[PDB]
Amino acid sequence: HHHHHHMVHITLDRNTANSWLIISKDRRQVRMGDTHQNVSDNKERFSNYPMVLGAQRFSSGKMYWEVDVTQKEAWDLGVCRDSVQRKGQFSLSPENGFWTIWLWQDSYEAGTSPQTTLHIQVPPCQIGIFVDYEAGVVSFYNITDHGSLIYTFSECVFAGPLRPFFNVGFNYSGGNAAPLKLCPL
Numbered sequence: 530h531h532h533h534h535h536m537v538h539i540t541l542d543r544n545t546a547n548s549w550l551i552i553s554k555d556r557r558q559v560r561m562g563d564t565h566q567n568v569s570d571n572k573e574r575f576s577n578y579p580m581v582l583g584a585q586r587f588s589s590g591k592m593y594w595e596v597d598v599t600q601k602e603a604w605d606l607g608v609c610r611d612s613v614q615r616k617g618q619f620s621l622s623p624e625n626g627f628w629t630i631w632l633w634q635d636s637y638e639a640g641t642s643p644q645t646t647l648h649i650q651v652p653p654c655q656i657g658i659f660v661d662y663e664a665g666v667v668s669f670y671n672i673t674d675h676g677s678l679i680y681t682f683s684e685c686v687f688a689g690p691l692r693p694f695f696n697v698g699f700n701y702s703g704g705n706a707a708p709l710k711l712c713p714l
């Protein structure tokens with residue numbers, strides 16, 4: 530792909546983080562802690578899952594960023610509406626305001642309803658995410674495999690401002706402690 534010139538500098542919004550997340554000083558890395566991180570509750574925080582939003586809001590244009598997923602067993606990445614549900618149980622789907630892919634149990638899937646099997650020959654260490662607001666497109670790229678396409682959501686109905694979306698996943702196994710990291714431009 531040739532989307533690199535739409536690179537945007539994403540930072541994480543502490544206020545939206547699940548209370549077990551640890552966000553680095555530079556707001557570019559997140560991992561799930563082994564306990565509650567001693568923050569107050571608020572209506573923005575994802576309560577049920579180890580999720581956090583980027584601070585940036587997008588309502589027009591083309592945007593691109595990259596995320597490092599090295600050594601993780603489970604994660605979700607993409608974009609979501611600013612107005613997504615924060616509290617209780619929900620599925621990641623475009624009907625609920627999410628445009629995402631994930632790794633889970635050694636398979637990759639797109640967050641359609643129902644979910645769609647992805648075909649990845651080279652497990653990615655970094656993921657590129659491209660959003661074209663006007664076109665209604667969200668695309669995912671395998672940076673480890675020379676930028677090969679992973680998945681395109683088209684005919685997207687954003688229906689509001691978009692925010693970068695992250696889930697570091699649980700660490701029941703002891704093998705999923707590693708952070709998600711926003712990679713330099």
Ligand SMILES: O=C(O)COCc1ccccc1
Pocket residue numbers: 547549576577578579699700701
């Ligand atoms: O099972 C665990 O590792 C943590 O449980 C508490 C919790 C933390 C974050 C989100 C939901 C529940």
